[PDB]
Design a protein around this ligand. Structure first.
Ligand SMILES: Oc1ccc(C(=C2CCc3cc(Br)ccc32)c2ccc(O)cc2)cc1
Ligand SMILES: Oc1ccc(C(=C2CCc3cc(Br)ccc32)c2ccc(O)cc2)cc1
Lengths: 9, 221, 228, 10
């Protein structure tokens, strides 16, 4: 998920 | 952690975490074009919201799974209460962007439009303060998906803190204890309508189902 | 008038005496049978809700058209919060009727019912943990009736403030400190946001199986068509 | 008109 990735980056 | 910050520090933290008011992409036409612009705007607003949520006291203390779920549940709510907040001093119009004032007469759009306009008129009537707004918006993020092994008493503890934060602001505003409970209730009852506008807004979006991030947020419902 | 003059005790007693009765189900494992029993129950509950709404202080003062609007807006919310309240002393269960106890497994018959079931159970679990009182419940239900459709009005806000003063009074008469009074007030009202969510999710599912042919009652169809 | 009307008056 993009949302999970943006919460990481 | 974040459960030690005073009422003033809580407000300042939220105020400093405030995302900017993004611009949209001035002739006439169009319904497709209309929702094409709102989609492009919301998509870019999402990126700021995600990093805004990180700065929300207590949100970073939660697991990656819960943070995803909370944002998936309340992203449209947070967008709409921000929209309503922008359009406070613009009666009869919605300020989607500083270069985008839409009136009511410009599928299912006008129904939500009037609800958004009514919500903005309510903020104007109550003379909503920015310190109260950032509290309500943070409440939405934590409360919307809290009831959808692991305890969530931490979330309730932060919510109770924001409640104290809200009350502390109103006591400094010279409001009596009775006036403090009442307006507190008035603010939180609006979140019920904000939830409603989101639900009606959500279903209209996955009925016309273009942004990649929005598709993930939308499929969550 | 009539509502703003009453004390918190008179407000509570009025709401308690106005409480609708707990109806019984018809004397399930099928989609048709399941929705059939729920539809039949909900329709008969609506009739009692309307009369309960009449005995809600301030609701009478409203014009007929506004009374209609508020009921059309919050009827499913009011049905759900009542269900949740009935299911408090039945953890992991939903008490639609004294002769109709249901767990989340029996909601697998009807599409979308499982999701709403869990949200209903989570709400009932929250009332339990908060130890919600009946005096507080009747206040929350009256708030839903007056608030949910108020933005789709000045007098209604005044009555809402009265119920707020009433809730604080109940908590103050319970031995809670000022900090605990606001806080619990906030915790209760935030749940109404979830009740709104369940209603909207429940509404679109009812409308889904309305165009797809269980035959909803004429009253239910009217309430449902109010949400397009 | 509506059934809700009659039940609200009766
Ligand atoms: O993909 C979309 C398109 C529009 C919306 C919004 C809204 C507002 C009006 C509306 C009406 C309908 Br029907 C559906 C969505 C929306 C919205 C956009 C930006 C904001 O800052 C706030 C809200 C969000 C995501
Ligand atoms: O026609 C109907 C069918 C079901 C419901 C209800 C609900 C509850 C669970 C549910 C799940 C789905 Br999917 C659809 C509707 C409903 C309901 C009925 C009675 C109550 O006291 C409370 C709620 C109301 C009217």
């Amino acid at each position: 998920k993009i949302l999970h990735r943006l919460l990481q980056d | 952690l974040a459960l030690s910050l005073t009422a003033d520090q809580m407000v300042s933290a939220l105020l400093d975490a405030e995302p900017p008011i993004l611009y949209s992409e001035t002739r006439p036409f169009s319904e497709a074009s209309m929702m094409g612009l709102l989609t492009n705007l919301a998509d870019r607003e999402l990126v700021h919201m995600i990093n805004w949520a990180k700065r929300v006291p207590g949100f970073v203390d939660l697991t990656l799974h819960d943070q995803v779920h909370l944002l998936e549940c309340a992203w449209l709510e947070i967008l709409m209460i921000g929209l309503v907040w922008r359009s406070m001093e613009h009666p009869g119009k919605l300020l989607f962007a500083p270069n985008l004032l839409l009136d009511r007469n410009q599928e299912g759009m006008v129904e939500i439009f009037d609800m958004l306009l009514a919500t903005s008129s309510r903020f104007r009537m109550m003379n909503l303060q920015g310190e109260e707004f950032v509290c309500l918006k943070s409440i939405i993020l934590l409360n919307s998906g809290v009831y959808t092994l692991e305890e969530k008493d931490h979330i309730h503890r932060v919510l109770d803190k924001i409640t104290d934060t809200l009350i502390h602001l109103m006591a400094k505003a010279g409001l009596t204890l009775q006036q403090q409970h009442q307006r507190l209730a008035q603010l939180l009852l609006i979140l019920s309508h904000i939830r409603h506008m989101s639900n009606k807004g959500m279903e209209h979006l996955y009925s016309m189902k273009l942004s990649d991030l929005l598709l993930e947020m939308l499929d969550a419902h």
